[PDB]
Design a protein around this ligand. Sequence first.
Ligand SMILES: [Mg+2]
Ligand SMILES: [Mg+2]
Lengths: 86, 62, 71, 105, 115
Amino acid sequence: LSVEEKAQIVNEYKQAEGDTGSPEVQVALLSANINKLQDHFKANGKDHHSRRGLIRMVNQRRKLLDYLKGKDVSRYTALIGRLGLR
Amino acid sequence: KVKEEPFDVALRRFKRSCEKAGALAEVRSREFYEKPTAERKRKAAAAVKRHAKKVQREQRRR
Amino acid sequence: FFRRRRFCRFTAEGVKEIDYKDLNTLKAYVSETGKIVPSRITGTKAKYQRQLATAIKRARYLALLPYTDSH
Amino acid sequence: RHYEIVFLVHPDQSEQVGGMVERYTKAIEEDGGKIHRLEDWGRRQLAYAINNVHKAHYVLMNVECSAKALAELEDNFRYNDAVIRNLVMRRDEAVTEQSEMLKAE
Amino acid sequence: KTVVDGIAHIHASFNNTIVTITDRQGNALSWATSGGSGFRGSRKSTPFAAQVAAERAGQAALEYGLKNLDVNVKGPGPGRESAVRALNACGYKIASITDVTPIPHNGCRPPKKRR
RNA sequence: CUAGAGUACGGUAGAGGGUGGUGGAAUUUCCUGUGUAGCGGUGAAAUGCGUAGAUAUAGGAAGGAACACCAGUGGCGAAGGCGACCACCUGGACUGAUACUGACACUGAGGUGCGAAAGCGUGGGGAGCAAACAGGAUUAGAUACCCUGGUAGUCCACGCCGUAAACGAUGUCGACUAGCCGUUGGGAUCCUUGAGAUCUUAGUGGCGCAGCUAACGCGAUAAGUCGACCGCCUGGGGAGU
Ligand SMILES: [Mg+2]
Ligand SMILES: [Mg+2]
């Protein structure tokens, strides 16, 4: 993922902060990066050592959602529907 | 390559220049194929014979 | 200490990114037959020895340096 | 970006190579890529035989183009008989001029 | 027939040694082998027998002249340097001596190890 | 709340993957010249190859796979594994500064994946090497070792199989405990010329005190002192049947 494509996302899903630590910043950065790789793995089929890196990012994303659900519900469904998951 | 002036000088300038270049021990290791485990024994035994030589000489360097 | 100064042939100067163009440098590091020297003879640091081996293999490809005494 | 295309031509085409420079670099300017050096090292002797010749004519060139003009010169060198070897490179930096032909004379 | 400044080729295996006198064109003038001198066995591989066959090639070479020789030594076996000292014994000006040795960078794989 | 954990920012190092392309040395087959009696092999020989012109030697063509020297107790990868050069996509680690989130962590029965090599299926491709096999020799005997040949295979695409002395014969994670000599990479401080200096993290090696151990031996990369979860052992054969 590029540098300005990171800066496009942090500007968008900022929690009126200027700050990159909140889960709505972190979940957004991972989800844009999984969608980019899906055509790398339709050309490269036998790329197994890079398949291993993608499953790290998927499992990291389901851990931050349950932390988000384990605190609030209003912040949760305002983020699930804004990305279209589950 | 050795050019030329007596002849015995250019012989010893050729016997030595071949050995100081090589290509005589390398030919001798082309006549039987070593499986790569047996080439990991040269890599194992020669590393022991170098690090032990740096310490056994220190006993002479006492 | 000739093996000590040649370590400083790349580290004392700011010549960190060596090129395959300075043949006057690279001919100091190639033996009379054509094969490449070790790094316990020059004594160069192993960061640059790896970097030195690429500039040989590229200059060899462009026919700037031979391989053997045959051709 | 920031390529360092080096290619050598046939010794019998070293007369014609002056038009061969701009014939390639005009298409790069169509892409939108400026050129930061263009050196001609001249006629030198090889270290060995490449299709049974011994002279050549080295052409040094540093180009900063996008992905289309790289696809141009990748193909044009393959479809020629003047050019006998090439080498495309990549550095992640810019280019200053006048490297070594002063020092090579 | 008259030729000068010939080239001497020396091929030295572990069991036999073959010496050939040629020209710059790569054409045969005189060949001589260690087996043709009548050794045929354990005596065949000795560096002494690489002197008998060396001078015998150097005697049918004076049919054509060849006052100058250029030596290419090729092979791992013994008699690799003993054959050169048996060349100017016949009275030949040896100009330069050159190693030629086929060394593959990777090459085909060799046969298996003996037991 | 920020000490665990994760993000944003500079910055290095690497045979970490996948898709194409291009080299040089050597081997073999073929063509052509010169040239003429053996070559090859071995404790020694023989089978074999040779004037129907071999080996040698020079010129040319085609084709296949491996990638000298660098190369190292050296690197990278979760493990198996990974060495020609370039482009092409692509994963993670290190190191520094700085802001943010504020415990978001650990392990994991079942379940899901990636699995050397030999082998199996359909299609390619056939340089060398080489089980099965054939001949010679050795041999009371020799299916064997040694010699001359030689097929599946090894190579590529797609799919399968799932085991190895799959080894550090040592499950993952966290915290404390004398030292000294090396080495990869990275910041420091420092008089500055250093063949510099000392300190600090992340690896990787050689000795060693306490301590433990049946002994051998490990010893900040524990088999030392302690925690959290899991797997597994119960005399030898019978039998991992
Ligand atoms: Mg293993
Ligand atoms: Mg076990």
